[PDB]
Design a protein around this motif. Structure first.
Motif, short mmCIF file in Angstrom:
data_model
loop_
_atom_site.label_atom_id
_atom_site.label_comp_id
_atom_site.label_asym_id
_atom_site.label_seq_id
_atom_site.Cartn_x
_atom_site.Cartn_y
_atom_site.Cartn_z
N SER A 53 0.74 -1.17 0.05
CA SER A 53 0.04 -0.09 0.12
C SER A 53 0.81 1.17 -0.03
O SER A 53 1.77 1.24 0.79
N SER A 66 1.03 -5.67 3.89
CA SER A 66 0.10 -6.36 5.05
C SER A 66 0.07 -8.02 4.66
O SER A 66 0.06 -8.08 3.63
N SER A 68 -1.85 -11.62 5.73
CA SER A 68 -2.80 -12.56 6.42
C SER A 68 -1.86 -13.64 7.29
O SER A 68 -1.03 -14.13 6.94
N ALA A 110 -4.10 -10.67 10.77
CA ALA A 110 -2.85 -10.13 9.80
C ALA A 110 -2.11 -9.20 10.41
O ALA A 110 -2.47 -8.81 11.30
N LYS A 120 3.85 -2.43 12.55
CA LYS A 120 3.13 -1.09 12.97
C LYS A 120 1.74 -1.78 13.57
O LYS A 120 1.35 -1.13 14.25
N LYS A 121 1.37 -2.55 12.79
CA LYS A 121 -0.27 -3.06 12.93
C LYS A 121 -0.55 -4.41 13.18
O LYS A 121 -0.03 -5.39 12.59
N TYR A 123 -4.46 -7.01 12.71
CA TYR A 123 -5.82 -6.99 12.29
C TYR A 123 -6.29 -8.22 12.91
O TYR A 123 -5.84 -9.30 13.00
N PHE A 125 -9.94 -10.34 11.91
CA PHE A 125 -11.04 -10.38 11.14
C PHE A 125 -12.22 -11.26 11.83
O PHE A 125 -11.76 -12.16 12.37
N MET A 164 -13.90 -6.34 10.31
CA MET A 164 -12.33 -6.46 11.01
C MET A 164 -11.99 -5.38 11.61
O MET A 164 -12.89 -3.94 11.64
N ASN A 175 -8.77 0.90 14.18
CA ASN A 175 -9.90 1.07 13.21
C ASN A 175 -10.93 0.12 13.41
O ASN A 175 -10.81 -0.92 13.52
N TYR A 177 -13.70 -1.35 10.87
CA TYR A 177 -13.90 -1.50 9.28
C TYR A 177 -15.41 -1.81 9.14
O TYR A 177 -15.69 -3.24 9.45
N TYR A 218 -14.19 2.93 7.52
CA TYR A 218 -13.38 2.95 8.99
C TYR A 218 -13.07 4.29 9.53
O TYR A 218 -12.15 4.96 9.17
N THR A 220 -11.04 5.77 12.69
CA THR A 220 -10.03 5.67 13.77
C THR A 220 -10.33 6.16 15.01
O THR A 220 -10.64 7.53 15.14
N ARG A 230 -9.86 10.45 12.37
CA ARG A 230 -10.08 10.25 10.97
C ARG A 230 -10.93 9.33 10.38
O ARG A 230 -11.30 8.37 11.25
N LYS A 286 -5.22 6.70 -0.51
CA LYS A 286 -4.52 5.49 -0.38
C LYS A 286 -4.95 4.45 -1.53
O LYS A 286 -5.88 4.56 -2.10
N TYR A 290 -3.02 -5.61 -4.28
CA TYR A 290 -2.74 -6.91 -3.65
C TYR A 290 -1.69 -7.75 -4.56
O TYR A 290 -1.90 -7.99 -5.77
C1 LIG Z 1 -4.35 -8.15 4.86
C2 LIG Z 1 -5.52 -7.28 4.57
C3 LIG Z 1 -6.69 -7.71 3.81
C4 LIG Z 1 -5.45 -6.05 5.50
C5 LIG Z 1 -5.82 -4.72 4.85
C6 LIG Z 1 -4.86 -3.86 5.22
C7 LIG Z 1 -4.90 -2.40 4.51
C8 LIG Z 1 -3.80 -2.05 3.62
C9 LIG Z 1 -5.99 -1.77 4.59
C10 LIG Z 1 -6.43 -1.49 6.05
O1 LIG Z 1 -6.35 -0.11 6.28
P1 LIG Z 1 -5.13 0.59 6.76
O2 LIG Z 1 -4.43 -0.42 7.99
O3 LIG Z 1 -4.12 0.92 5.87
O4 LIG Z 1 -5.59 2.05 7.41
P2 LIG Z 1 -4.65 3.09 8.20
O5 LIG Z 1 -4.08 3.95 7.13
O6 LIG Z 1 -5.69 4.01 9.20
O7 LIG Z 1 -3.54 2.36 9.10
#
Ligand SMILES: CC(C)=CCC/C(C)=C\COP(=O)(O)OP(=O)(O)O
Length: 306
Positions: A53, A66, A68, A110, A120-121, A123, A125, A164, A175, A177, A218, A220, A230, A286, A290
């Motif tokens: 991303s 990101s 899974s 994820a 950083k993060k 997830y 689901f 999620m 977040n 979703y 979503y 935050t 946001r 953004k 994939y």
């Molecule tokens: C493996 C999968 C399907 C996960 C999706 C991850 C993604 C790039 C979108 C979620 O938003 P974000 O996490 O980019 O949001 P923010 O910019 O608020 O961190």
């Protein structure tokens, strides 16, 4: 065997370098590889979801990856903390992924990292046929009080089922979703009132038309206040021209990324997820391209990109 597995991880790293290079971003291998290796099982299993991303504006020199992680693997945050890949925050956000699995059916995890700053993060689901609402999420003790404090607002705007969640450990943010969005929720009058009530940047008609196309929305939230930091509208498509900006630089950059980002399901078109993010002071865009998809993405494309 062991060779082919190691090569799969190397291929994923090479794709990530390629995607970062479309942005002019250099990759730090000693920050990325330990994380990839830690989750190499998930990258060879084959039901893998991998997204690279990028974002516009002040976030234009970042690339997020990101990946899974099946629930069978066990909580991924506990893994990265125990391996020393991320320092525990000492904040409720540390507890939240584990707490969420303790209270609700979680169908998959994820992780997310950035090519320069590392992990950083996480997830969580939920099963698509069994998603929680705001009330059930509020029963998780480590959920920000802000979730419950915004319950009346979410209900008024039709923000109901949550597919999620994500936890940002460095920013101490969550977040939610939302899914199964009604057409009334996404009509211009509804979106405008929502954004104005939250005190966020008011979009123009190009942004509103993008919002009407959303498959997910979503907000935050944080643990310090009930103010939403946001709000993001997400659109899934095979169309590489959808960035909701009238700036020619954005239009060119996002189309470039959407048509060149690496992916392994060649023979299909790339799955793209666009974001319109509204904060109190700014709007920005953004695009996740994939690298690996599953039936989930194909089904969303059929439902939302037809
Ligand atoms: C493996 C999968 C399907 C996960 C999706 C991850 C993604 C790039 C979108 C979620 O938003 P974000 O996490 O980019 O949001 P923010 O910019 O608020 O961190």
């Amino acid at each position: 065997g062991p060779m082919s597995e190691a090569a799969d991880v190397e291929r994923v790293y090479a794709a990530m370098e390629e995607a970062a290079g479309l942005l002019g971003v250099a990759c730090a291998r000693d920050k990325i590889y330990p994380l990839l290796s830690t989750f190499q099982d998930t990258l060879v299993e084959g039901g893998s979801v991998v997204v690279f991303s990028m974002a516009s504006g002040r976030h234009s020199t970042e690339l997020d990856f990101s990946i899974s992680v099946p629930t069978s693997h066990g909580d991924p945050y506990a893994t990265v903390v125990e391996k020393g890949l991320f320092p525990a925050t000492g904040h409720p956000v540390d507890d939240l992924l584990a707490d969420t699995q303790k209270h609700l059916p979680v169908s998959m995890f994820a992780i997310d990292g950035e090519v320069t700053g590392g992990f950083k993060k996480t997830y969580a689901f939920f099963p698509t046929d069994n998603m929680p609402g705001v009330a059930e999420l509020s029963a998780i003790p480590s959920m920000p009080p802000a979730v419950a404090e915004n319950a009346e607002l979410f209900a008024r705007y039709g923000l109901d089922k949550v597919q999620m969640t994500s936890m940002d450990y460095k920013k101490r943010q969550v977040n939610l979703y939302f899914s199964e969005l009604s057409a009334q929720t996404l009509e211009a009058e509804s979106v405008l009132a929502l954004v104005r009530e939250l005190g966020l940047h008011v979009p123009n008609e190009l942004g509103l038309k993008f919002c009407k196309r959303s498959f997910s929305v979503y907000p935050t939230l944080n643990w310090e206040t009930g103010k939403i930091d946001r709000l993001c509208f997400a659109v899934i498509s095979n169309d590489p021209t959808l960035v909701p900006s009238s700036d020619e630089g954005d239009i060119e950059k996002f189309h470039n990324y959407a048509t060149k980002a690496p992916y392994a399901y060649v023979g299909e078109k790339r799955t793209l997820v666009y974001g319109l993010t509204l904060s109190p002071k700014e709007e920005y865009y953004k695009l996740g391209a994939y690298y690996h998809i599953t039936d989930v993405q194909r089904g969303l494309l059929k439902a939302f990109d037809s």
